[PDB]
From Swiss-Prot, chain A:
Membrane keyword on record: yes
A GO molecular-function descriptor: proton-transporting ATP synthase activity, rotational mechanism
The UniProt record lists the keyword Transit peptide: yes
Name of the molecule in the record: ATP synthase subunit delta, mitochondrial
Location of this fragment in the whole protein: 33 to 158 of 160
Gene Ontology process terms (BP): proton motive force-driven ATP synthesis
Localization, UniProt: Mitochondrion; Mitochondrion inner membrane
Protein origin, superkingdom: Eukaryota
Species of origin: Saccharomyces cerevisiae (strain ATCC 204508 / S288c) (Baker's yeast)
Keywords for the protein's UniProt record, in alphabetical order: ATP synthesis, CF(1), Hydrogen ion transport, Ion transport, Membrane, Mitochondrion, Mitochondrion inner membrane, Transit peptide, Transport
Function: Mitochondrial membrane ATP synthase (F(1)F(0) ATP synthase or Complex V) produces ATP from ADP in the presence of a proton gradient across the membrane which is generated by electron transport complexes of the respiratory chain. F-type ATPases consist of two structural domains, F(1) - containing the extramembraneous catalytic core, and F(0) - containing the membrane proton channel, linked together by a central stalk and a peripheral stalk. During catalysis, ATP turnover in the catalytic domain of F(1) is coupled via a rotary mechanism of the central stalk subunits to proton translocation.
From Swiss-Prot, chains D, I:
Remaining remarks: Present with 164000 molecules/cell in log phase SD medium.
UniProt subcellular location: Mitochondrion; Mitochondrion inner membrane
Function recorded in the entry: Mitochondrial membrane ATP synthase (F(1)F(0) ATP synthase or Complex V) produces ATP from ADP in the presence of a proton gradient across the membrane which is generated by electron transport complexes of the respiratory chain. F-type ATPases consist of two structural domains, F(1) - containing the extramembraneous catalytic core, and F(0) - containing the membrane proton channel, linked together by a central stalk and a peripheral stalk. During catalysis, ATP synthesis in the catalytic domain of F(1) is coupled via a rotary mechanism of the central stalk subunits to proton translocation.
Family: Belongs to the ATPase alpha/beta chains family.
Complex and partners: F-type ATPases have 2 components, CF(1) - the catalytic core - and CF(0) - the membrane proton channel. CF(1) has five subunits: alpha(3), beta(3), gamma(1), delta(1), epsilon(1). CF(0) has three main subunits: a, b and c.
Protein name: ATP synthase subunit beta, mitochondrial
Organism, as annotated: Saccharomyces cerevisiae (strain ATCC 204508 / S288c)
From Swiss-Prot, chain G:
Subunit composition and interactions: F-type ATPases have 2 components, CF(1) - the catalytic core - and CF(0) - the membrane proton channel. CF(1) has five subunits: alpha(3), beta(3), gamma(1), delta(1), epsilon(1). CF(0) has three main subunits: a, b and c.
Top-level taxonomy: Eukaryota, Fungi, Dikarya, Ascomycota, Saccharomycotina
Protein purpose: Mitochondrial membrane ATP synthase (F(1)F(0) ATP synthase or Complex V) produces ATP from ADP in the presence of a proton gradient across the membrane which is generated by electron transport complexes of the respiratory chain. F-type ATPases consist of two structural domains, F(1) - containing the extramembraneous catalytic core, and F(0) - containing the membrane proton channel, linked together by a central stalk and a peripheral stalk. During catalysis, ATP synthesis in the catalytic domain of F(1) is coupled via a rotary mechanism of the central stalk subunits to proton translocation.
Recorded superkingdom: Eukaryota
UniProt name for this protein: ATP synthase subunit epsilon, mitochondrial
UniProt keyword Ligase, yes or no: no
UniProtKB/Swiss-Prot annotation, chain J:
Oligomer and partners: F-type ATPases have 2 components, CF(1) - the catalytic core - and CF(0) - the membrane proton channel. CF(1) has five subunits: alpha(3), beta(3), gamma(1), delta(1), epsilon(1). CF(0) has three main subunits: a, b and c.
Ligand binding (ATP): 1-8
Transmembrane segments: none
Protein's job: Mitochondrial membrane ATP synthase (F(1)F(0) ATP synthase or Complex V) produces ATP from ADP in the presence of a proton gradient across the membrane which is generated by electron transport complexes of the respiratory chain. F-type ATPases consist of two structural domains, F(1) - containing the extramembraneous catalytic core, and F(0) - containing the membrane proton channel, linked together by a central stalk and a peripheral stalk. During catalysis, ATP synthesis in the catalytic domain of F(1) is coupled via a rotary mechanism of the central stalk subunits to proton translocation.
Subcellular location: Mitochondrion inner membrane
Protein name, per record: ATP synthase subunit alpha, mitochondrial
Organism from which the protein derives: Saccharomyces cerevisiae (strain ATCC 204508 / S288c)
Additional detail: Present with 41500 molecules/cell in log phase SD medium.
Family to which this protein belongs: Belongs to the ATPase alpha/beta chains family.
């Protein structure tokens, strides 16, 4: 059972399969999966409760299967549909920004976000 | 006169009554949004607590405190000032991060040296991820938060929708997370840096929740205070009204007597 | 009282609350007027006290706001700080006449903000001591205020130097 | 309106409203402050304070009671200068640079003087 | 206290209590009580009379009447005459009581007379010799010495406060004459405290050297205690000390 | 009314309009008679005049004149001498409110405000 | 830079389709002023 | 006015201002040594004012329908409506129109505050068309008054809609 | 300061100033609580509350009527007693302790009674 | 302002500073001070003259008095004859 909670939403609180992109590659959870902590990287996420499947765009967070089979996912914001080319225009600007210059790291994060955006 | 000075003063009280009424209402409106946010935030926090509980994470103490910049949010500011002071006797050397001006002023008096950091701009805004994140980020860099093998945060838990009890909780360090139980029931290898990452992530996640709890308590307190104010203003209105009416009659009588006395002669 | 007010060319209103507040003379400038004005004010004292009224007027408005709370901006609290010292500066002890030559310095110090440098409680000590300092050192300056009764550029500078030297003390 | 000239009237009506707003808001300012007071309202308050001290203007026969020669400002000039203020064409001029001086030419000049 | 706050009832209860005193034998333990009804409706007085006869108390009490209808000069002379009747008992040594209800309406009566005699209006438009009248009336009721036969005539004059404010010329004049006052609080009466005896504004002078020792011992300091209760609930409306809370709990009971 | 009560034995009900305006009228007549106007203008004979009026109004053993009077408070000041004199005569008060009629309640009688002294 | 600062920047970026609600956007902006103190003595309040 | 009314026509007489009428009568009365009265006005000033104001009426069809409408004007001496001459006139009149100073200053001309303006005959002689389209108007404005104090943060949309409607 | 000496006068002066403040903020206190006053002032207010209670001194012969045995305090003792209170020496114990008691020593003792 | 609350004292201070010139020379920079006391008790006046004698200022003070006991006509006459002096 997925507990998907956000500081302004909580779309899940049983969720059968969840496929997650983590700093360990991709992890899939099906029923009892090993009770772990995994840092969620910025992601394109699928949550399936039964066969019904919900596509989520995830801003990174943490995933933690609890030993009581509660897959606590915490992330800052969520659906995949919300992602939809102005972001590409902003990312072009962000590429420019790294040339001059926290801003260096930020623009690097923007390149990461560009990858995450491309994933959609 | 007596009459006019009564009357103008009574007008002042009337205007005060009107304002305290108006404010109390505006506060109620604002409170609704604050509370709405707080539920979602609190649910998120509980998921993190699920890890900490099962982990039995159990963590120089750091003190963080939260109040709004804004005043007249009941006794949030000073109930918190007293309860911080109690645990500043329990660590008479603690580095105080004061999130918002109001707790800063009172607390600053009790130990000036202990005041190391303070923030501002808190109260004007309603809690948002950016603020919490940035305060946290600065906590790590500026205050070197991880070095402190104890961290504690103070906030106001909005105990009931008409009450607030200032409350604290311990922000857990990465060392504690490492050696806390139920490893394997939470796996870490070495190819992840989950204690050092999760500590940071939950440093902010706990702080945002604390801010949400506090903010809701603050706006709630302000509503409560402005309501009680209206009652007190009403009493003064009634007292000066009776005075006004009596004074009015007395003037009439005294003037009438003067004319009569003259006429008699 | 109404009849008399019309007849007279001034009012020297005394506030009862301010008497209890310990301001003696307890005069309030809001109800005290001199309709003949500063034509009767000696030239030196006219120069020093030019904005003393303005500062006090600003203090009064700012102070009113302050009682109704609300975090006062630094500019208002500058006023508040200046004003508070001024209030203590006004205070006097009954049956203690003062020489005008030695009233000109005290007002100069206040208006030129030197007294904002000194803590409110010990302002009274500072005034007394300042006079003592002038008696010791710039007693030449005091003589000039008596003798010429108008502060020239040289006197203003001398007086300024004297005050600055004693700000430290 | 017509009697004193339509423009003169409208300008003066705007002045009255601006000042009246400031006076009504004075009560709000007393407890609440400018803290939760609107930006538009604040601009109106700021204009009202500027207008309030634009009223100030010494008298030649109060060189005794001031020392600054009075100002005899032409009617047309007053209408024009007050109109500008309301429009906020001179909201880039300090509040105290309207105080105890004549028309716009003086008000701007006193802004420069304070700047120096 | 305030008008028609069962003002009459408070006095009536005194008369009722002294029924068993009057069913007594010791003549000291007899109050022959006079109810002076000035400015009251003939109907209300008649109901009162019937009430007194219902408690069969009429036989030990006199009623003097100067009703609302009755002429203002009669009303002026109404307390003075009543006090003469009282003096016969008093000067027979025997204890008695006289309740002068309402001397405030007598003040209005004397006011009328004075104005119609065109004597200049006094303070609050009540003639200035109103003090002399009340003081002369009131001081004719007294505890006399054993030589004089231990005379007693207790006086309870009933003043109807204007706007319930004890500052007021007619009330204050009376307060100064009397040796204690029994102000009743309208707010408490309304808020169902019957009897509504304000203890903020009830005082008594030498009354505290007339009560039986039992009611001094048992009731000792309770007046002080409930003037701590008054204070306690004054500032109760933040954190209550256990001492204050205990007092509030006691106060409430 | 007295012919009805006394000489037709009836219980009757006598309306009076403003008794403020009864008082007001009396006050004028006093001034006309040249008598010194007593407190707050009101006639020195104010008390006695109401007394005559409201003691002829009484319950006899023949009949009874019940009287409904309309008391138009002077400026809503119940502290004024004329209302006070009135209230002494009044036995019950029916306190209609227009707020109450606006709550769709006809009778417009404000229930909380209504009080009688023969509600014993 | 800190991990949660990384996630923060990402979250802020992630609020860009542009069709998203004001509350997200408000959550993606802050005007707060980071006052800095130490031992009371204040380094200048750099914007948060 | 009576001549027109008597002739069966209608007419409107505007007494402006009875406050000054009072003063003149005061001057006469005091000089004629008649006793003074409330607010130093003669005692039978009520009798005079009422007598004057009851010579305005809508006469029966026996009397040929004629009328004399009247509109007395009373000048408020510092807004003291508890003043003796105002109180008397207020009682006599069947409605009052109460102009408020703030409104005048706030540029609302007519500066009639319709809060304390009442007519006791009112809608009985209102144009039917205008009656239909303005019962609502009274209610809207009533709300606008209550929602006036909402002029100064987080505020219900319903109130804001009212506020907009009311201002317009 | 001459007639009854400077120490007496200074002690009295502070009492007068303190009490006048307490009366001055009496309005504000009612309108909004005492915990909604400035901290510096709040100390003054709390002190003043003690001073007010301190002024009591059970009646010395109407002791019967009050029901509390009288207290008579020397003038020399009085100056000392107030001096201490102004320095807040004995401010740390209940308002009840200062209420209906004589000299400073009695307050201390009455704290012990209360402490039980 | 409010009675007796240094009511005398505010004025008396003025008289006292005019001592500085009076003791000195140049008659045009001197003043002569005439203190008129109407309706006041002999004891008040006596204190005032004691104060003046203490400050040795009765070398230029004139005290025109009409004490509280003294007749109402003399009190009416008191300012106008003080004016003459």
């Amino acid at each position: 059972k997925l507990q998907f909670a956000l500081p302004h939403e909580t779309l899940y609180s049983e969720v059968t399969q969840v496929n997650l992109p983590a700093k360990s590659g991709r992890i899939g959870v099906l029923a009892n999966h090993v009770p772990t902590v995994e840092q969620l990287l910025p992601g394109v996420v699928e949550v399936m409760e039964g066969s019904n499947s919900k596509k989520f765009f995830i801003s990174g967070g943490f995933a933690t299967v609890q030993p009581d089979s509660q897959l606590c996912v915490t992330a800052i914001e969520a659906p995949l549909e919300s992602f939809s080319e102005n972001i590409k225009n902003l990312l072009a600007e962000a590429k420019k920004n790294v040339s001059s210059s926290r801003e260096a790291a930020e623009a690097a994060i923007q390149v990461e976000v560009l990858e995450n955006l491309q994933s959609v | 006169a007596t009459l006019k000075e009564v009357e103008m003063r009574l007008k002042s009280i009337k205007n005060i009554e009107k304002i305290t009424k108006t404010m109390k209402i505006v506060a109620s409106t604002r409170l609704s949004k604050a509370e709405k946010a707080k539920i979602s935030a609190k649910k998120m926090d509980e998921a993190e607590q699920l890890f900490y509980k099962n982990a039995e994470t159990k963590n120089k103490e750091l003190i963080v405190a939260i109040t709004s910049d804004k005043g007249l949010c009941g006794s949030i500011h000073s109930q918190l000032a007293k309860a911080v002071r109690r645990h500043l006797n329990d660590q008479p050397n603690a580095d105080i991060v004061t999130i918002g001006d109001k707790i800063k002023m009172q607390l600053l008096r009790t130990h000036p040296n202990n005041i190391k950091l303070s923030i501002n701009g808190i109260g004007k805004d309603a809690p948002t991820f950016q603020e919490s994140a940035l305060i946290a980020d600065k906590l790590l860099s500026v205050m070197k938060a991880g070095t402190y093998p104890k961290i504690s945060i103070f906030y106001n838990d909005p105990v009931s929708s008409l009450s607030f009890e200032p409350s604290e909780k311990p922000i857990f360090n990465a060392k504690t997370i490492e050696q806390s139980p139920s490893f394997g029931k939470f796996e870490i290898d070495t190819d992840a840096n989950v204690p050092r990452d999760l500590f940071e992530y939950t440093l902010a996640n706990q702080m945002l929740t604390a801010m949400a709890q506090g903010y809701a308590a603050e706006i709630s307190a302000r509503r409560n205070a402005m309501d009680n104010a209206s009652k007190n203003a009403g009493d003064m209105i009634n007292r000066y009204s009776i005075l006004y009416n009596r004074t009015r009659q007395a003037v009439i009588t005294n003037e009438l007597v003067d004319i009569i006395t003259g006429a008699s002669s | 009282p109404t009849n008399v007010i019309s007849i007279t060319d001034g009012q020297i209103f005394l506030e009862a609350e301010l008497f209890y507040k310990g301001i003696r003379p307890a005069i309030n400038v809001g109800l005290s007027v001199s309709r003949v004005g500063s034509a009767a004010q000696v030239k030196a004292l006219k120069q020093v006290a030019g904005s003393l009224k303005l500062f006090l007027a600003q203090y009064r408005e700012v102070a009113a706001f302050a009682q109704f709370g609300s975090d006062l901006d630094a500019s208002t609290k500058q006023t508040l700080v200046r004003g508070e010292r001024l209030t203590q500066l006004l205070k006097q002890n009954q049956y203690s006449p003062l020489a005008t030559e030695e009233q000109v310095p005290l007002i100069y110090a206040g208006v030129n903000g030197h007294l904002d440098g000194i803590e409110l409680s010990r302002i009274g000590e500072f005034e007394s001591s300042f006079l003592s300092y002038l008696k010791s050192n710039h007693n030449e300056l005091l003589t000039e205020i008596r003798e010429k009764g108008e502060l020239s550029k040289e006197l203003l500078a001398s007086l300024k130097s004297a005050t600055e030297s004693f700000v430290a003390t | 309106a017509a009697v004193v000239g339509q423009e003169h009237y409208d300008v003066a009506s705007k002045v009255q409203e601006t000042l009246q707003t400031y006076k009504s808001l004075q009560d709000i300012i007393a407890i609440l402050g400018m803290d939760e007071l609107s930006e538009q309202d604040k601009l109106t308050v700021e204009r009202a304070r500027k207008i309030q001290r634009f009223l100030s203007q010494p008298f030649a026969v109060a060189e005794v009671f001031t020392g600054i020669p009075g100002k005899l400002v032409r009617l047309k000039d007053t209408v024009a200068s007050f109109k500008a203020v309301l429009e906020g064409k001179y909201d880039n001029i300090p509040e105290h640079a309207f105080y105890m001086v004549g028309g716009i030419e003086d008000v701007v000049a006193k802004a420069e003087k304070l700047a120096a | 206290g305030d008008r028609q706050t069962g003002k009459t009832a408070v006095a009536l209860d005194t008369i009722l209590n002294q029924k068993r005193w009057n069913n007594g034998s010791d003549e000291s333990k007899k109050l022959y009580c006079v109810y002076v009804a000035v400015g009251q409706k003939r109907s209300t007085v008649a109901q009162l009379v019937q009430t007194l006869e219902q408690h069969d108390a009429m036989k030990y009490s006199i009623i003097v009447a100067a009703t609302a209808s009755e002429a203002a000069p009669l009303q002026y002379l109404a307390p003075f005459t009543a006090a003469s009747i009282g003096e016969w008992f008093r000067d027979n040594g025997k204890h008695a009581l006289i309740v002068y209800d309402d001397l405030s309406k007598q003040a209005v009566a004397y006011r009328q007379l004075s104005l119609l005699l065109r004597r200049p209006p006094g303070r609050e438009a009540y003639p200035g010799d109103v003090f002399y009248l009340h003081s002369r009336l009131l001081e004719r009721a007294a505890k006399l010495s054993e030589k004089e036969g231990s005379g007693s005539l207790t006086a309870l004059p009933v003043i109807e406060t204007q706007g319930g404010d004890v500052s007021a010329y007619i009330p204050t004049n009376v307060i100064s004459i009397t040796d204690g006052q029994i102000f009743l609080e309208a707010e408490l009466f309304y808020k169902g405290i019957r009897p509504a005896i304000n203890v903020g504004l009830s005082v008594s002078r030498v009354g505290s050297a007339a009560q039986v020792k039992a009611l001094k011992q048992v009731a000792g300091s309770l007046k002080l205690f409930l003037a701590q209760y008054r204070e306690v609930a004054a500032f109760a409306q933040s954190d209550l000390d256990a001492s204050t809370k205990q007092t509030l709990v006691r106060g409430e009971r | 009314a007295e012919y009805f009560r006394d000489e037709e034995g009836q219980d009757v009900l006598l309306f009076i309009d403003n008794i403020f305006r009864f008082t007001q009228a009396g006050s004028e007549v006093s001034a006309l008679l040249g008598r010194i106007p007593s407190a707050v203008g009101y006639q020195p004979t104010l008390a006695t005049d109401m007394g005559l009026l409201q003691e002829r109004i009484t319950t006899t053993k023949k009949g009874s004149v019940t009287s409904v009077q309309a008391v138009y408070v002077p400026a809503d000041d119940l502290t004024d001498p004329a209302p006070a004199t009135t209230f002494a005569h009044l036995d019950a008060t029916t306190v209609l409110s227009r707020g109450i009629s606006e709550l769709g309640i006809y009778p417009a009688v404000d229930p909380l405000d209504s009080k009688s002294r023969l509600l014993d | 830079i800190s991990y949660a600062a990384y996630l923060n920047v990402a979250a802020q970026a992630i609020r860009s389709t542009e069709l998203q609600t004001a509350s997200v956007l408000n959550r993606s902006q802050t005007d707060a002023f980071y006052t800095q103190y130490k031992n009371a003595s204040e380094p200048t309040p750099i914007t948060k």
